[PDB]
Amino acid sequence: IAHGDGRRPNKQRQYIVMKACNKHHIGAEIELAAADIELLFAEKETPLD
Amino acid sequence: NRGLYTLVNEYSARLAGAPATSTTDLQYVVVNGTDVFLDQPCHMLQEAY
């Protein structure tokens, strides 16, 4: 604001605010039993398999 | 001591006779009046509460 008093008319100030990026990591663990992987690729022909 | 219409014109325009400072530690006397906003009514009426 331009003022009408006797003090020093202060110049504007440009601030340079320098931010960052907070990183985060999320992970969940999933077990698969070995008797489940084994009969996934196994050849099947009977109606029970 | 003057007429009380000129006291009303003095009450808003002219700053009074040496009030305190604003935002200091030890409450100094005000000087140079750059941004000074003091409305004291205990000076004209000459009383204290």
Side-chain angles (χ1 to χ4, degrees):
Chain A
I1 297 169
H3 291 88
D5 291 329
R7 73 267 189 95
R8 296 288 171 91
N10 289 320
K11 78 279 191 185
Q12 60 176 352
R13 279 84 62 194
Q14 293 183 358
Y15 292 100
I16 300 169
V17 172
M18 190 69 200
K19 293 289 181 68
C21 294
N22 289 318
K23 289 179 70 67
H24 296 289
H25 185 274
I26 296 173
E29 289 184 354
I30 293 95
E31 290 181 354
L32 296 176
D36 199 5
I37 303 168
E38 192 270 332
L39 56 91
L40 181 61
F41 293 103
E43 186 177 2
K44 73 282 190 186
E45 65 180 0
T46 180
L48 191 143
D49 287 333
Chain B
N1 202 8
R2 296 177 293 173
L4 61 90
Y5 287 108
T6 58
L7 299 179
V8 174
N9 287 318
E10 189 177 1
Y11 183 77
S12 67
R14 300 291 180 89
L15 193 145
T21 43
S22 296
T23 312
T24 56
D25 293 333
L26 296 176
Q27 193 178 4
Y28 295 102
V29 64
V30 74
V31 70
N32 202 10
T34 62
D35 286 329
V36 172
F37 295 96
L38 269 297
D39 289 333
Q40 53 181 358
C42 295
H43 189 270
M44 179 180 175
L45 296 173
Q46 295 289 319
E47 68 179 0
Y49 298 97

